[PDB]
Amino acid sequence: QWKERNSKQSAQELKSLFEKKSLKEKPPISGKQSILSVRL
């Protein structure tokens, strides 16, 4: 079910509890499309 009144007072804790700001995978690489070519 659904219940309200969750994490409504901790600001500094919510600043890093779930907002990890995960930013990676900047370098893109090429491929050969294994599954696509296997299906075809």
């Binding site: 079910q1 659904w2 309200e4 969750n6 994490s7 919510l14 600043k15 509890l17 779930f18 907002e19 990890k20 700001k21 995960s22 930013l23 995978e25 893109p28 491929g31 050969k32 499309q33 294994s34 599954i35 696509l36 299906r39 075809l40």
Partner: protein, 319 residues
Amino acid sequence: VGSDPVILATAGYDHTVRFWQAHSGICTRTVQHQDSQVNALEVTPDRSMIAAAGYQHIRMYDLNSNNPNPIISYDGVNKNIASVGFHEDGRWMYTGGEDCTARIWDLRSRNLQCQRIFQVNAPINCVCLHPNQAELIVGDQSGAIHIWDLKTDHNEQLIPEPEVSITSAHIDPDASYMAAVNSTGNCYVWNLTGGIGDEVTQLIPKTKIPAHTRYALQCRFSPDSTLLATCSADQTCKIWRTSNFSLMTELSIKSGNPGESSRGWMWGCAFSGDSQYIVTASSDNLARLWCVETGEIKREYGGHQKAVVCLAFNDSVLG
């Protein structure tokens, strides 16, 4: 079963969720979804289960085992759930509901309470997570675009054109642009955050793509960030390029005879890891698989007995 690098499934009005594989177009497992229609479904990033959202409930179906029933079901909202999605690591699920709310859920059976609610005075039509899993874009039935960052508790509001309801929005995985479409075909493209440092979330409208005389139902980028596919109510799906935003390729299911009278819309689309073969879900009681270059269809799956309004296509990271 889902023990395969690539999987794909469709859902519609025939009260079934069809799974198959692009080998011969034959169905593997047909999951029973009843008493409601499926608005949208999404696979979990760990590739263990699927989640289909429709009319006040989100039902999860195991992919590893052979189970036709909704092992995990979520309740509590009062209207439809337009779109769902999970964190890149499977930590929190963001659900935009029809009534007024875009909320988050906690996927752990513990008192974690990382769930929040974003409330607007208009019915939500689409939610889109940021590629950095920090921001989240909301598009409602009033042409307003609410870029809401999970870091803070304030959200900016942007209206390209009022009195017209936007239908979808998406951000390329490389975070190069941010596109959205409304109920008249217009496709505005604002430049997304360029300040990766402290999430400035600056927006400047680059261009507008005038197409899709009829309603535009969904627009999606490509994992390679070199293509952008948008589907319209005129039985067309147009794929555009990211260099000059011109018409790269156009596909259509029109038979060319006045005797059908719009026999089916193109509801959803998705790309592949190679950005070469796309899958489209039409309302012709079947789904199609096309190539972004040769134009003609490559495959067709016709196991459904009603319309098809949503589909999921996941493949390996290699591509």
